[PDB]
């Protein structure tokens, strides 16, 4: 996605723990259960990653709410899944099939500029059709 | 009142002119019948000729009111472009029509426009403005038709096109992307009135058009808004708050007073009976005291059109220098009346410019009660002008950069061509001008750098060898598909290189001209020429045949073919050069023919291609170019008979036998031998007449590179297309360097183009109708 | 000629007027005698960075047009864009 600082350099650096589990001495003190957190929608708030989630789900790809996504992580701590991590590290792709959209940066930015540009050409036209009705019918008759 | 009003056929006579100019005091030379030249008539004679048409407009039953309350508010004249004034034996016809019969809180205002037509073609129009006083409620007859101002609207976003397309009055004819482009609206209205603040039937019907980048305008749309019983104009309200008006007058930040140190007093006459006889305005509120007292006036007041015609003679005296053709339009508002025999002073001043014409503002007041009587302004043409454009050899590091930072229209031409230079050629021409470097490396790194390299491999030129023909080779032979960088080197700055000084000089002289033209400082009919490089800068600005992006293309290419046309040696030098000869610094009897014979003598004896390539000043400046050891004899033949001092034989006449072809033969031959003894990197040897032109290693404007014009012709034919040429911007005004006659389309002007070029492109049109 | 065939000849004249221009001598003596003494111009304006040929226009009117400018009593201006910018732009001093 880009323009995120060292966010992707610190999440990718955390993926050495699956190989450092074997090569080091902390196997019986720590168990690794890394989880790929998917496209989680926010709190229903005003976000650019919330407005395009509807058009992103038209491709057959699931986006998650924060209560569905928490149920996925809470299912990684069931006592049969805590036992799986003691035999070796466990990677859980909780990403909802979003890894099959290849042009994902350019497709999502196409969905932002689709939603934003019709927000302008409908607002400015509603403004200019409003102004045009007040020069023809006069400013005297706007009291309703 | 909507049909036009014919005013009949009227003539001009010498008895009508001379009685007119005496009645107003117009003692200009053009209106008095001298011997030799035809007599002219003033613009004020149009209200005499168009009196029967204009005054018939207030008369219909639909435009109602009494003439005894009628006020003449204003009256203006305007001459159509390209029109001569009225002659002595001129016969004219006039057509008038009414524009607006609007009502107000006081009575109604009638606007009448009448044009004068000489032999079918219109010469000038006159628009008046009358005012029936009273209280009127006839709104069924009230109308107003206009031609609205040329608003230009730009569309720099995709919502601006959608706002425009949502309007039902916008009929988009030719579907085209209007993003980052500008439309111009020529709209005209026709309004009926209902109660002086609401309308009855609005009809705005205009057009819209776009300038496409091959110097071409096309209609892209059509405005059609036919409403009724509305309150205002939404078409005009859209163009007001979105676009800006163009073709408007440009006012100075400080006006300048015109007749300084002179009081311009124009005291009203004793009677109004003489002006009423010379104009036909026989209404008795100016001559009869009974009618002037019945119509509630202070007295038998002076004609309003007298006051215009008498103050026009002061503009014709002080703004124009008593020449009538320079007065193109004059309007005046009759605010407050004058009685006969009262003193009044004017105040001429120059407040702005439009289309190269000067806007002189006048203001006439009475000297005693100090109330303003006449407010008007004129449209005095400038003196006849020529814009010459400088060639190469004069270039400074930082030229035009003070104008670049101050003017916004001189910045948008330097910027528009620098974007073209970076994206297509890999350097900045603003970087060259602001600090000329010794080196400049163009890099071909990325995907957009390998496309820049494709522009260097795809430019070709031609030359001849010792024997053979044209070759059609690459200019940059050292640029190929494995080349990652190319460097330009010049040991005396990069403004000294010809391929960088030519697109930097034509850009500055276009930036300089475009700043003047945006201020309204350039006349309509003005000649132009350029010396050696400026004739490309002349017709990109006054000719308007190529845009700024293709101008710098054909002139970077021009200085490139004028660089590889000479076979340079192991260094950057060669055997060809240039010298500047002065036939009166030395050898005080020489003329243009006494030195053209000498350079032809070394052109025939020992050959070597020595000729003169520009005749700048007669007997003062000739710059001749040739090869070294041929050009070195010229600076050591004419430069040696000021020391041993034989004056040449044509001091009075040649002797009756022909020794002049053979007595100066051995002196040019005894210097021809010692030129061969000099080393072939031949030095300059200025002498006393010749100035040693340094940096010019190519014989410009000779016939040595006659062979190279064939790739340069086919390059020009694809950057100056046929539709881009406007003939009226060149005919009779452009003066080339090839044929020093002005540009004309005549069958014997084409002869001199053939006997200088021998081109088959004009040969196969020379033999037709 | 017809107006739609005006610019056909005006194109093919102008390109050959430019193509052979740099391979033919510059006729600058014989064109200063066109915007002087054939079109009696009262102001010449040199658009350039330095007055090289605003200079040589004043040398021409001092050589063959001194009695001609006086007899017709016309006042010539040989203004250049580089240094005469006050009376090019009609912005004089407020005196």
Author numbering:
A (entry chain A): 821 to 964
B (entry chain B): 1295 to 2063
C (entry chain A): 1 to 95
Paper text:
In particular, yeast type I FASs are 2.6 MDa hetero-dodecameric complexes with an α6β6 configuration, which form a cage-like structure comprising two dome-shaped reaction chambers on either side of a central platform. The mobile acyl-carrier protein (ACP) domain tethers the growing fatty acid chain and carries it between active sites, so each can act on this in turn.
The α subunit is mostly resolved, though several segments of the peptide sequence (including the ACP and PPT domains) are missing (residues 96–322, 535–598 and 1752–1879). In particular, Q171 was shifted within the active site of the AT domain.
